[PDB]
Amino acid sequence: EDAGLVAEAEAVAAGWMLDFLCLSLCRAFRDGRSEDFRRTRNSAEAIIHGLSSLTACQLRTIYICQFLTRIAAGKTDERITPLESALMIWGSIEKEHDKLHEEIQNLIKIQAIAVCMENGNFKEAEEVFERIFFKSKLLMIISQKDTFHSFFQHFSYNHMMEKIKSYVNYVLSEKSSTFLMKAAAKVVESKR
Amino acid sequence: EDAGLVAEAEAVAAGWMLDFLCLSLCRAFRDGRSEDFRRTRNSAEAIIHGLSSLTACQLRTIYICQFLTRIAAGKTDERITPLESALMIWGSIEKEHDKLHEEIQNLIKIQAIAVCMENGNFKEAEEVFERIFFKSKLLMIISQKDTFHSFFQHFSYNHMMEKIKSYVNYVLSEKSSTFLMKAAAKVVESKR
Ligand SMILES: O=C(NC1CC1)c1cnn2cccnc12
Ligand SMILES: O=C(NC1CC1)c1cnn2cccnc12
A&B contacts, CB < 8 Å: 82
CA nearest to B157, candidates B114, B126, B128, B124: B114
- The answer to whether the CB of A57 falls within 8 A of the CB of B67 is no
CA nearest to A191, candidates B180, B8, B56: B8
Q: Do B12 and A188 touch (CB under 8 A)?
A: yes
With a CB cutoff of 8 Å and minimum separation 6, the contacts of A142 are A113, A117, A122, A125, A126, A129
Q: Do A187 and B9 touch (CB under 8 A)?
A: yes
| Closest chain B residue by Cα to residue A31 | B3
The amino acid that residue B75 corresponds to is: K
**Contact residues, chain A, for B17 at CB < 8 Å:** 17, 20
State the Cα–Cα distance between residues B135 and B132, nearest whole angstrom: 10
Quick check: CB of A144 below 6 Å from ligand 1? no
- The answer to whether the CB of B87 falls within 8 A of the CB of B112 is yes
State the Cα–Cα distance between residues B17 and A39, nearest whole angstrom: 14
Cα angle, residue A165 at apex, residues A163 and A167 outer, rounded to 5°: 75
The amino acid that residue B86 corresponds to is: A
State the Cα–Cα distance between residues B56 and B23, nearest whole angstrom: 17
Structural Rg of chain B based on CA atoms: 19
State the Cα–Cα distance between residues B171 and B175, nearest whole angstrom: 6
In angstroms, the separation between the Cα of residue A42 and the nearest Cα of chain B is 6
CA nearest to A20, candidates A164, A137, A182: A182
What is the residue with the minimal CA distance to atom 1 of ligand 2? B66
Quick check: CB of A42 below 6 Å from ligand 1? yes
State the Cα–Cα distance between residues A114 and A132, nearest whole angstrom: 13
Q: Do A3 and B181 touch (CB under 8 A)?
A: no
State the Cα–Cα distance between residues A100 and A159, nearest whole angstrom: 12
Provide the b/e sequence for B92-119 (b: ≥16 CB within 10 Å): eeeeeeeeebebbeebbbbbbbbbbbee
- The answer to whether the CB of A51 falls within 8 A of the CB of A11 is yes
DSSP letter at A145 equals: T
**Contact residues, chain B, for A180 at CB < 8 Å:** 13, 16
Closest ligand 2 atom, residue B45 Cα: 5
| Closest chain A residue by Cα to residue B192 | A5
**Alpha-carbon torsion, ordered B153, B106, B165, B96, to 10 deg:** 160
How many other C-beta atoms can be found within 10 angstroms of the C-beta atom of residue B60?
A: 15
**Which of B3, B13, B20 lies at the smallest CB-CB distance from A181?**
B13
CA atoms within 13 Å, Cβ hemisphere of B146: 12
**Contact residues, chain B, for A39 at CB < 8 Å:** 46, 49-50
Closest ligand 1 atom, residue A25 Cα: 6
CA nearest to B129, candidates B112, B108, B107: B112
**Alpha-carbon torsion, ordered B104, B109, B112, B115, to 10 deg:** -70
State the Cα–Cα distance between residues B34 and A91, nearest whole angstrom: 37
User: What's the full length of chain A, in residues?
Assistant: 192
**Contact residues, chain A, for B40 at CB < 8 Å:** 50
**Which of A5, A46, A183 lies at the smallest CB-CB distance from B188?**
A5
Q: What is the distance of C-alpha B36 from the center of its chain?
A: 15
Q: Do B184 and A42 touch (CB under 8 A)?
A: no
State the Cα–Cα distance between residues B27 and B32, nearest whole angstrom: 8
- The answer to whether the CB of B20 falls within 8 A of the CB of B36 is no
| Closest chain B residue by Cα to residue A185 | B9
CA nearest to B95, candidates B68, B63, B70: B63
Structural Rg of chain A based on CA atoms: 19
State the Cα–Cα distance between residues A185 and B7, nearest whole angstrom: 10
Give the orientation angle of helix A34-49 with respect to helix A56-72, to 10 degrees.
Answer: 140
Distance between first and last Cα of chain A: 39
State the Cα–Cα distance between residues B146 and B140, nearest whole angstrom: 9
With a CB cutoff of 8 Å and minimum separation 6, the contacts of A157 are A74, A75, A111, A114, A115, A118
3-state secondary structure of A22: helix
With a CB cutoff of 8 Å and minimum separation 6, the contacts of A47 are A14, A17, A18, A21, B43, B46
State the method.
Answer: X-ray
The amino acid that residue A81 corresponds to is: T
State the Cα–Cα distance between residues B151 and B114, nearest whole angstrom: 10
CA nearest to A10, candidates B177, B43, B185, B30: B185
CA nearest to B70, candidates B175, B169, B164, B174: B164
Quick check: CB of A61 below 6 Å from ligand 1? no
**Alpha-carbon torsion, ordered B173, B175, B177, B182, to 10 deg:** -120
Q: What is the distance of C-alpha A151 from the center of its chain?
A: 24
